[PDB]
């Protein structure tokens, strides 16, 4: 239909229902559409035309979703900066963006000043009253809400998400965005949803909000994940979905307030983005008490690639918690060797994917794009193996593989064996220098609750008799905690091992 057409049709289908809900503001579908139309006119009145870059700096307010959609309705290129990014990383993105405008949240004017000092930008605009540039919400306030039709090229990029790559802005056009929408309906089920987005509107949260609106639903916004707030919100706002990082799942399931929370409105807790720990997902199932969990494997480059359904989490005759599920309709998966050759089902190699959800490409990085997408196939930089039912099992990121005297030890697979043991809650496996074998296998393991001394020889034996001898951790370190990224922090583990 056209992506922005899909979004607007959803909002019209929900004209009298709630569409954008935060702690501070609640808009109906019709109200949301009006704000979009008038914000779009305000932006066009500032001189913005199709293909103009619009860089933003905001949190997850209603104003932010409105802005994101309005920018794209014009056919401009939305480039959202995450607040969490370092100021210097922000400047770099801003410099690279060829920005025709910079739109910032008033709250954040200090940092906006730093950035614009580094990278002077025309059309500085604020989401409300603020020191720098003009007040976009004021300007939108005073335009007509007469509809603005999308007339730009469905194929030209309207959004740039920062944090692809295995820095990197990932360009997305309406075409690939609509395909992502269609896939989300397969994963999340038919709309309307009441979808708790606590992920940045700057990128993935913003996409999920778009899809929610497009399928006729309500976006329930939070700035970030805090388990007590989320448990309360699910009940108070009657959410059908909340998209989680795997660790968030475990925090919900283990929280003391879970008993008192009302989860009855949930249809799903879709999760992914980082490797799950199967045994911890198994505990979460039990604690939640019904098949809510849906495992989602995707990337900014690839869109949605596979999903494991809620019912496949509890399939009677299989155990699939170490799988990321099966291909989305329309998605082809090939598992390839180092030379690019397709491997028979069952073999480990690089996960490569072809679908209409593929990104347009990396913003201004043509060499890397041609390296990453070859003959229409995304090379994910993940390693894995399919089975005869079509389930995909990720065994490593290519960069994490540990080479022990010419043998390949897949760190995530070893981790799953360790965490599978009842004594082990969490594990991280990394390679360290070895005089004899070049690399040796190092594992850090966090004991489970009610576990005393880990039997390290038991753990080595389990790995040995599941994967084979070379997969065994030579070095096995009991730790209190596994360091994290802003994924588990494998470089940090590698470093702390020397000392
Ligand atoms: N559900 C998931 N399970 C494991 N790793 C994932 C999942 N979703 C995303 N990833 C990882 O993060 C990357 C996305 O930027 C993937 O290519 C993959 O390595």
Numbering used by the authors: 1 to 166, 170 to 489, 492 to 504
Sentences from the paper on this structure:
In this report, we describe the activity and specificity of an ABS from Streptoalloteichus hindustanus (ShABS), with a broader, complementary substrate spectrum to that of McbA that includes enantioselective behavior toward an expanded range of acid and amine partners in amidation reactions. The requirement for large excesses of amine in these reactions has prompted investigations into the ATP-dependent amide bond synthetase (ABS) class of enzymes, also members of the larger ANL (acyl-CoA synthetase–non-ribosomal peptide synthase–luciferase) family of adenylase enzymes, as these catalyze both the formation of the adenylate and the amidation reaction within one active site of the enzyme and require only one or low equivalents of the amine as a coupling partner. In common with other adenylases, McbA features a larger N-terminal domain coupled to a C-terminal “cap” domain.
As crystals of wild-type ShABS were initially not forthcoming, two mutants, K492A and K492H, of a lysine residue K492 implicated in interacting with ATP were prepared and subjected to crystallization trials, in an attempt to obtain a structure. Although no crystals were obtained in the presence of ATP or AMP and acid substrate, the inclusion of the noncleavable ATP analogue α,β-methylene adenosine 5′-triphosphate (AMP-CPP) was successful in giving diffracting crystals of ShABS K492H in the P21 space group, from which were obtained data sets that were refined to 2.01 (Data set #1) and 2.57 Ångstrom (Data set #2) resolution, the second of which contained density for AMP-CPP in the active site. This structure of ShABS (ShABSAdFigure 1a) featured two molecules in the asymmetric unit cell, each of which corresponded to the “adenylation” conformation of McbA, with an rmsd between the two enzymes of 1.50 Å over 469 C-α atoms. The major differences in active site residues between the ShABSAd and McbAAd acid binding sites were W307 (ShABS) for F301 (McbA), W214 for C209, R175 for H170, C299 for N293, and S302 for T296. The presence of the two tryptophan residues is most likely to account for the differences in acid specificity between McbA and ShABS.
